[PDB]
Amino acid sequence: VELTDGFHVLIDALKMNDIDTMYGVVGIPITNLARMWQDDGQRFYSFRHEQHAGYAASIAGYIEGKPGVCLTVSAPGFLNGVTSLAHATTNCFPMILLSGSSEREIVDLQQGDYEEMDQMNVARPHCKASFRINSIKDIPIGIARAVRTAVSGRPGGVYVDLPAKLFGQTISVEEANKLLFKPIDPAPAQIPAEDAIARAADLIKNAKRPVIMLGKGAAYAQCDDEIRALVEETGIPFLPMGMAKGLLPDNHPQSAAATRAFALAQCDVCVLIGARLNWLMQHGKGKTWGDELKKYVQIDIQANEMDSNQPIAAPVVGDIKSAVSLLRKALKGAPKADAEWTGALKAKVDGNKAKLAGKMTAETPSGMMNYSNSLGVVRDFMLANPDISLVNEGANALDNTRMIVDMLKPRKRLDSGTWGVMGIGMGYCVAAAAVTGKPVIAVEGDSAFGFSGMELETICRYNLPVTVIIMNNGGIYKGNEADPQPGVISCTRLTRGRYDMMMEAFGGKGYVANTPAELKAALEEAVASGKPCLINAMIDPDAGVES
Amino acid sequence: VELTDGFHVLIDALKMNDIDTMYGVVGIPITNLARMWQDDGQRFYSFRHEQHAGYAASIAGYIEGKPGVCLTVSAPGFLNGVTSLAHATTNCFPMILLSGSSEREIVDLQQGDYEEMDQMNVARPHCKASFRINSIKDIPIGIARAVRTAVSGRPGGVYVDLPAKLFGQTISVEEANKLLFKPIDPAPAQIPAEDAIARAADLIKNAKRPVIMLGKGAAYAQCDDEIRALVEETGIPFLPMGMAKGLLPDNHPQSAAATRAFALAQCDVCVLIGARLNWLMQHGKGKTWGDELKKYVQIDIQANEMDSNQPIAAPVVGDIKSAVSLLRKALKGAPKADAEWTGALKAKVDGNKAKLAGKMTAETPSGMMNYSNSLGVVRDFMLANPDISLVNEGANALDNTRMIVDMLKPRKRLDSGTWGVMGIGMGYCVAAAAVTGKPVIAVEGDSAFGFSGMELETICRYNLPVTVIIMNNGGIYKGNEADPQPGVISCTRLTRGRYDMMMEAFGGKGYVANTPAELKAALEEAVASGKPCLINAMIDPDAGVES
Amino acid sequence: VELTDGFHVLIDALKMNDIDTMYGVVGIPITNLARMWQDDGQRFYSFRHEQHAGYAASIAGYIEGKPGVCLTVSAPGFLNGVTSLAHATTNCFPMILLSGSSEREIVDLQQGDYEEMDQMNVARPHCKASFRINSIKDIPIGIARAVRTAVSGRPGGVYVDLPAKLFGQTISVEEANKLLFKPIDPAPAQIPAEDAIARAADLIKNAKRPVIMLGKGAAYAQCDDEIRALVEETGIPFLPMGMAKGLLPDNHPQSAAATRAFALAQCDVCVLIGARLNWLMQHGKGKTWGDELKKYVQIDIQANEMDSNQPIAAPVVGDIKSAVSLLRKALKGAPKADAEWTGALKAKVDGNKAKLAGKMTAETPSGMMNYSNSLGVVRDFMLANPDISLVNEGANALDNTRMIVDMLKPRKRLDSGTWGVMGIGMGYCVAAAAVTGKPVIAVEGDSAFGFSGMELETICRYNLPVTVIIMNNGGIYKGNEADPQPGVISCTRLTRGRYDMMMEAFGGKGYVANTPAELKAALEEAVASGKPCLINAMIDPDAGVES
Ligand SMILES: Nc1ncnc2c1ncn2[C@@H]1O[C@H](COP(=O)(O)OP(=O)(O)O)[C@@H](O)[C@H]1O
Ligand SMILES: Nc1ncnc2c1ncn2[C@@H]1O[C@H](COP(=O)(O)OP(=O)(O)O)[C@@H](O)[C@H]1O
Ligand SMILES: Nc1ncnc2c1ncn2[C@@H]1O[C@H](COP(=O)(O)OP(=O)(O)O)[C@@H](O)[C@H]1O
Ligand SMILES: Cc1ncc(Cc2csc(CCOP(=O)(O)OP(=O)(O)O)c2C)c(N)n1
Ligand SMILES: Cc1ncc(Cc2csc(CCOP(=O)(O)OP(=O)(O)O)c2C)c(N)n1
Ligand SMILES: Cc1ncc(Cc2csc(CCOP(=O)(O)OP(=O)(O)O)c2C)c(N)n1
Ligand SMILES: [Mg+2]
Ligand SMILES: [Mg+2]
Ligand SMILES: [Mg+2]
C-alpha cells in the first residue's frame, strides 16, 4: 500500500483550488514545502522580507480575484507576514497566509519552544478567519475553508497555521484521493431583491444633479462592461477612487475627476459602487459634501457596511455585477442626466485640465524637476502604453501621480490603499509582473521606497520587466529642512542617494534623470528592454508640500 | 497665565525619566513631536522602516538598562513597530513603543478612520502592558507606568498609545510642573530568602561535576565583577549563552564553551544564572543532558520561570546581583571544584581549540573563502580591539561567528536572540553606535542582511562608525542549489551581489574581500576610518551546511 | 508493565501540590475526574452554577494562601467559571480553573464541535497565565506552572485547559513516578533593599500626622503579629479596608476607622500596606485627601503598582512580611506618633461611635427595621463570637455592615471586593465553611442574594453551618419606588418574598425576623445549631438610600 505525506497532500489541495504561485521566504520548518512546490512545476518567489512577500500575495489577489498565497516560517517570520495580511483584510483583498509553526505541547505550556507563539490567536484581528490544520486528513477541508473565506462575502485575509508535525504525517494514496476535492462555486453571486433595485432606480431618476462614485470594490468585481454601460446609458457623471482609475478610462467624457470637490459638494444623489464612505471620502460630511446630508445609493456585498457613516437612502446589498446588471434594466429608457449639470462639470474639467497642462509643460533647472513636469512624462507614456501596471506610493509622489497619470485600463493602478501604507511598492511590482506577464512602472517617493527597497534584488533575480522611478527629492515631503541644532540632521531628511547604483549592484539597469527629456528617454528604453530597471528622477527638494 | 501643550509635557515627561534618544519614522500625527524633540536638544534617529527603529530601541534597552524608545505612526507604522516590541518582550529587553493613533469616536464605531486600528488592543500579546494616554494631565503618570513596567520584574516591551488629539491639548505651565515627577527606584533590587541561598549553596558544595550557565539576563544585570568573582572563587567551569559571551572574557581558563556538549551531558549540578532552560538549552532534556534530570540551581527575577521545563532543586528568585552576592558569601571558604573535573574539561577545550585553529589557517581560492578562515580574521581583530560592538545574525554566519569570535568585553555581542530573528542587524548597528559612542562591526549572513539592508542609508546618513561584513555565499545556507526546472532559480538562492556598490550609493565606503588578507586589511582600515563601511566577503557557495 | 492514565496522573499531581478540595459542576468530559477525586478520598463540592463554584475557589485561595481549584466542563460551563477567575485575578486571589475542552482538530478548523471554543485564548484577559496540557507526560509540569503562577508575585487566577483526549492517555507507573514532583518554594519571599526601607523609615519619622492603610493584601500575607507590632510600636493611627477588617481588631485603640474621611484628609504621610490607591481610595485625590498630594509609603509585591495613580515618595517592593519585618527594625526606638494627632482622631472616633450607638438602639415598627438596629444585633453577636466568617454584599447591606459589624479576627470578613461584585455570597459561604470547618454568617442584600440564591440548596446538601441573613427591604437600594405606568412594576422592585420558605424547600431551617429581638434569638439559635439556616430579616422598604 503506497503512501503520500503532508507536504504533498497540501501541494495537491492548493493546486486543486487553482493556486500555482506562492510568495514567501524559506527556512525551518517550511523550506522543503517551497522546494517540492517548485519540483512539481509550480512557481515560488523568494523575497528578502516576508512583509513584501505578503504585499505581493495581497495584490495578486486583487488583480486575479483568487487568493494570493504567502508562505512564511514561525514567530518572527509569521509576524512580518501578518502585517501584510492585515493590509489585505482592510483593502478587501483575498489572501491566504500559510505559516509553519512549532510544537503544540511546548507552545501551549509557554515553555520557550523554537520560535514560540500562538500564531493562530495573534492572527485573529488581522484576518477574516484564522485556522489551524493539525491533521493530514483535514488539509483538503482546511484549504477549502481558507479559499472560501478569502473570496466569499467581503473578500479579505485568512490565516492557516501549519504546525511542523503536519508535514511529515503519512496517509494512503487511496485515502488521499478520496479526501481531495474541489469547492463548488467559492465566490457565489448574491442578487438583490426587486424592491431594493427599484428604490435605487427611483432615487437616480428623480436626481437633479447625480453622480457615481466607483471604488476598487467595483474594479475588483471584473464587470467592466456592465459598469461602463450603466454610466453611459444614465449619462451620469462619475468619479473614480485611486484604484478605480482605469475601470472606465480616466479621459472618458463623463469623468468629473478633475472637478471632484465641486461635484461632491453640489450633487444631490451619490451612487457608491464598491466604495466605502470612509476617510478617503471624508465620511460623507464636512466641506467636501457641502455640509449637508446627501441621498445615497450604495451597492456593496457587505450588508452591515450600510449606514456605517451616513444614512443610506437606497442600500443595494449584493455582488456588484448582479446589482449593476439589474439596476441597468430598471433604468432602461429613462432620461439621461441633465445637460446643464453634466455640461457644467465638463467645463470645470476642461478648465482645470488646461491649468494642469501648463504646469506640466513648464521649465526647471537640470536636476531640480518638480512633480508636474516629471510626472507629465509618465502620463504621456501611459496614454500611449496603457497595458502596463502602475505601482504608486508616497506623499507628494502619490497625490500628484493619481492626479496626473491617466489610466486607460482597469486594475492596472496599484497604490497605498485604504491604510495609506508606505511599503507596498516592490512587492506589488513582483506580483503585478508575475500575474500579468507584462511590464510594470512604479512611481515611488524616496521615503516610500525605503520601506521595501531591498526587494530591488528580488526584482532583478527573477529578471522582471519592472521600471522603478524614484522621485528623489531628498526627504519625507521636502528634502531641505534645516538642521535643528549645530551638526544634527533633521528627521525628514533622506540622503539624495544614487538609487541607480543600488539597482546596478544586483544586476539591474540604472538611470539618472535630471530633466524631463532625460526621464522620457530612460523610461522609453527601460520599458522597451523588458529588464529590471531603476530611474533616479532628481526632484527639486523644495517642490513638495507637507499640509 | 502661561500655557504648555501635550507635545511639550510629553517631551518633559520623557526627559524627566532620563530619555534623550528616540528611534523612529515620522508622518501623521507625530512628525512635530519628532521635530520638537530635536529642537529641544535631544536626538532622533529616522529610519527607513519602523521595524528597524524598533530593533534599535530594543537593543538600546539591553545595553543601557533603561527603556529604548521607538516612535511610529498609526495602524501600518504601529504594526511594523509592534513586531519589534514582541521581540523585545521575548528577549526581556526594556522598550517603550510610542505610537500616534487616530480618532477615538471613529475607531470605536469602526467607520473607516485614517489608519484605523485599536492599536492598544492589537499590542497586548506582544508587550507586558498596553496603555493609552488620553489626556494631557496623565502624560507624566503614563510615562512613569511605562518605564516601571518596562524595567521592573522581568524587563520587557510596553506600548503607549498617543491619540492624535492628545498633542494639541493645553494646560498651564504651573499645573504641568506640579504633575511632572521622576519615579523613585523604578527597577528595584529583589533579595532572596536565606534558605533559598542555603539550598543552592548545599547543591554546589556537594557537586562532583558542577557547571555554571550564564545567560544574557546575567549580562543585562551589569554585575560582571560579582559574577566573575563567583566563578573564580568556586572554581566551577562556566558556559556562556550567545549574548553572555564576554561577560567573563571568552578566553577565561574556566570557560568550557569549547566543550559544551560534554560539560552539559556529564555534569551533576547545573547553575543557571539569568538563563532559561528553553529551546536554546534543549529544554533541560534529551541527548545534550545525558538523558537524566540534573540537579538545577536557578537564579532568576521571574518567580514562575521556575519549573517551566524541568524541576529546579534550588530556585533562587531575585535580581541577579543580589542573589550572586549572597551566594558568594554562602560559599565563602569552601573547597573549589574537583580538579579532575575541571582538568578533564580544560583538556577538551584545548584540544578543540587546536582543531579550530587548524581550520582558520587553511587556504582557499580567491573569492571562495570558507567560514573558518574568513571569521578567523574577525576573531584576531576582536582580540586586539575588544571595545567594539559585534552584531551578528544568519545561519552559518551566526553559528560560526559565535564559535570563532571571542568576546573579551560584556554586552558587546548583539545577535538574533531567543526567536532567532533575521532582521536585527542594521537597527542594532545604529543603536549600538548611538549608545556606546564607539565602533560597531556586523557579521551578517546575506539572507539575514536583506531583512534590514536598506538601513545602510540610515547608517550613512548619521555617519556612524559601523562596518558591515556580508558573508556573501549566494543564498540561504548555500548559494549553489540546482535549478529545480529549466530556467527556474531555486528558492534558496540570492544574487551574489555587489553590496559594496549599494553602500557606496549612499556615501559609505565599499570593499570586496576575496581572501583572508584582503578582508583583514579592509576590516582594519574600515574600523580605523571611523566612517560607515561595508565589506563584501566572498564566501564559497558550497561552504555552509543546512541541517 | 503496569499502567496509569490521565485521570490519575492529574489527581496525583494535584495532591502533590497540596490540593485536597475542588469546587465545580460535573458533566462531559470531566465527570469521572470528579468521581475518581472522591474515590481517592479527596473532597468535591458540586454547585448549581459554575460561577458560584468559581467564587468559592477564589475565596478558598484568599483564606488559605494556596490556589482554590474550580472544575468545569467545556464552552458554556467554562465561560461561567472564567467570570469568577477574572474576579480572583482582580482581587489578587490565587485560583486555578480546570476546564475540560473538546477535540483540537475540530475546534481549530471551527467546524462546530461539541461545546466548541478556544477556551485557552478566551481565558487570556481574565487570568495571569492561560495554559493547556495536551500530553499525559506534561501534567506534573503543567500543574506546577499553574500553582506557581497563581501564588507567586502578585497572586491571581490561572486557567488550565484539559482537552478531552488527555484523560484517557496511558503511561507506565514507573514513568509516572519519575515525572511527578513537588515544586520547591512556589511562593518565595522577596526582600527589599536597605535604602528602600531607610527612605520609608525617614518619611514616617519626620511625619507630623501619619497614618497606616491596611488592605486585604496585608490580610492575605498572614503576618498578623508583624503588622500589629509595627502599628503598636510606631503609635501610628491605622485604617483598614473592607477585608483588612479584623487584621488588627476593629476596636483596637489606634483605629481611626470611625473618623476615616478626617484622617485621610488631614494626614501628611500615608503608609499603604497591601492596599492599592484605586477607586476604593478615590485614587489618592479629590475631597477625601484634602485636594493635595500626600507623601506615600507603599509596600507591595508588584513593582509596577507604584506610581499607578499618584507619585510614591517611599516605594517598598517585596512581600509584606519581609518588608514590614525590616521596617520595624529600622524604626526601633524612634518616637511614637504625636499625642495631639492620635488623641484628636480618638476623640472623633468616640464621638462618632456614640452617634452610631444611638441609631442602633432606636425603636422601629415590627417588620420595618432599619439598617442600624438590625445590624446592631449582628455586631453584638460577632463581638461575643468572633471566630466566625462574615460574608457580606449588597448596597445599603454592605456599607452599613462594614461600618457596624466589628471584626476581631483576621481573614473572617469576605465581601464584594475590588469589583463590587453582587454574586459572591453563597459560593463564599460554601468555601469559608469548607476551609475553616467553623460557622459562617452572611449578611445579604435581597438583590445581591438573588445572583447566587439557588446555591442555598448546595449549602443544605453539604449540611454546612451557614446562616444567611437576608436584608429583605424589597428592592435594589429601596423597596418602594412607585409604578412608572399604570400596571407596571418599577425596575428596582423585588418581591418581598419568603426566603425562609425557599430555604426549607431544600431541608434547611427558616426564620422570619420582624424585630431586633426576633433577629437576635434566631441568629443565636441558628449559629448554635450548626445547621444550614436562613433568617428573613424584614427591613423597612424606605430605610435605604441610593446616592
Ligand atoms: N464583488 C463585489 N461585490 C460587491 N461589493 C464588493 C465586491 N468586492 C468588494 N466589494 C466591496 O467594495 C468595497 C471596497 O471599498 P474600498 O476598499 O473603500 O474602495 P475605495 O477605497 O476605492 O473606495 C468594500 O466595502 C467591499 O465589501
Ligand atoms: N536583573 C535581573 N535579575 C535576574 N534575572 C533577570 C534579570 N534580568 C532578566 N532576568 C531573567 O533572565 C532570563 C533571560 O534568559 P534568556 O533570555 O533565555 O537568556 P539566554 O537566551 O542567554 O539563555 C529571563 O528568564 C529573565 O526573567
Ligand atoms: N504577600 C504579599 N506581599 C506584598 N504584597 C501583596 C501580597 N499579597 C498581595 N499583595 C498586594 O496587595 C494588593 C492588594 O490590594 P487591594 O486588593 O486593592 O486591597 P484593598 O482593596 O483592601 O485595598 C495588591 O496590589 C497585591 O499585589
Ligand atoms: C508604514 C508607514 N510608515 C509611515 C507612514 C507615514 C508616511 C506618510 S507619507 C510618508 C513618506 C512621504 O515621503 P515620500 O518621499 O515617499 O513622498 P514625497 O512627498 O514625494 O517626498 C510616510 C513615512 C505611513 N503612511 N506608513
Ligand atoms: C524573520 C525571519 N524570517 C525567516 C527566518 C528563517 C531563517 C533562519 S536562517 C535564515 C537565513 C540563512 O541564510 P544566511 O545567508 O543569513 O546564512 P548563511 O548563508 O548560512 O551563512 C532564515 C531566512 C528567521 N529566522 N527569521
Ligand atoms: C454582577 C453585578 N450586577 C449588578 C451590579 C450593580 C449593583 C450594585 S448594588 C446592587 C444591588 C443593591 O441592592 P441590595 O438589595 O443587594 O442592597 P440594599 O441597598 O440593602 O437593598 C446591584 C445590582 C453589581 N455590582 N454586580
Ligand atoms: Mg520624498
Ligand atoms: Mg547566505
Ligand atoms: Mg435590597
Side-chain angles (χ1 to χ4, degrees), chain C residues 236-519:
Chain C
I236 293 177
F238 74 94
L239 295 164
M241 301 297 296
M243 292 184 54
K245 285 172 70 70
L247 179 44
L248 278 68
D250 288 356
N251 61 188
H252 194 281
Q254 299 182 217
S255 190
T259 184
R260 181 202 194 262
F262 187 79
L264 290 183
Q266 297 286 329
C267 65
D268 58 356
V269 177
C270 183
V271 185
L272 304 167
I273 305 179
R276 285 176 290 192
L277 205 48
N278 65 4
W279 74 277
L280 286 165
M281 295 194 205
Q282 299 74 53
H283 301 278
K285 52 195 140 175
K287 297 185 177 292
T288 22
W289 300 86
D291 289 296
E292 68 185 12
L293 180 44
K294 306 301 183 174
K295 283 167 176 178
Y296 288 103
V297 182
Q298 185 165 33
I299 296 165
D300 208 291
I301 191 148
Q302 190 67 24
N304 75 320
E305 189 50 44
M306 305 298 165
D307 302 337
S308 64
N309 289 265
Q310 294 277 79
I312 297 290
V316 173
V317 181
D319 75 278
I320 285 150
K321 190 190 291 193
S322 296
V324 171
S325 177
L326 284 178
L327 183 58
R328 218 158 62 79
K329 296 182 182 167
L331 294 169
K332 172 89 95 310
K336 295 204 172 185
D338 186 11
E340 306 285 49
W341 164 244
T342 61
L345 296 175
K346 181 64 177 184
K348 265 112 155 59
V349 175
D350 296 346
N352 286 188
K353 278 186 176 203
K355 211 149 186 131
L356 182 50
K359 287 183 156 198
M360 293 188 293
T361 207
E363 212 115 70
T364 57
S366 181
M368 318 228 92
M369 286 186 285
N370 60 48
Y371 288 89
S372 289
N373 62 7
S374 56
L375 296 173
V377 174
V378 180
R379 169 187 183 266
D380 288 334
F381 192 82
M382 283 301 288
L383 292 169
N385 303 101
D387 207 20
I388 298 174
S389 290
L390 194 90
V391 175
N392 187 214
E393 54 171 348
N396 291 265
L398 176 77
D399 291 351
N400 288 316
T401 302
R402 182 179 44 244
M403 196 187 57
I404 296 173
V405 180
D406 290 330
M407 308 304 294
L408 305 180
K409 274 188 141 61
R411 297 167 295 283
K412 296 300 187 183
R413 180 178 162 85
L414 315 166
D415 73 11
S416 297
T418 300
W419 264 351
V421 173
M422 302 308 113
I424 63 67
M426 300 302 101
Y428 278 20
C429 289
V430 176
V435 312
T436 68
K438 287 172 184 166
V440 184
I441 295 165
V443 184
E444 295 290 311
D446 58 332
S447 179
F449 166 83
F451 285 82
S452 59
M454 194 58 220
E455 302 304 329
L456 237 39
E457 188 272 338
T458 307
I459 293 166
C460 292
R461 172 155 40 87
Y462 293 111
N463 204 53
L464 297 174
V466 182
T467 305
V468 181
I469 304 173
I470 307 292
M471 298 286 91
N472 196 338
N473 73 332
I476 307 185
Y477 315 132
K478 282 196 180 270
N480 67 357
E481 195 178 329
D483 291 2
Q485 295 295 328
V488 177
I489 195 176
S490 169
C491 55
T492 51
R493 292 276 306 281
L494 294 166
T495 299
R496 200 113 180 286
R498 293 285 299 287
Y499 293 101
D500 60 299
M501 271 187 71
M502 174 172 182
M503 184 56 130
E504 298 221 328
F506 309 111
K509 173 65 175 179
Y511 302 87
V512 180
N514 295 129
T515 70
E518 287 185 13
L519 175 50

Side-chain angles (χ1 to χ4, degrees), chain C residues 68 135 180 183 205 214-215 236 266 379-380 527 541 544:
Chain C
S135 195
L180 286 169
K205 282 175 185 178
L214 303 174
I236 293 177
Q266 297 286 329
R379 169 187 183 266
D380 288 334
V527 177

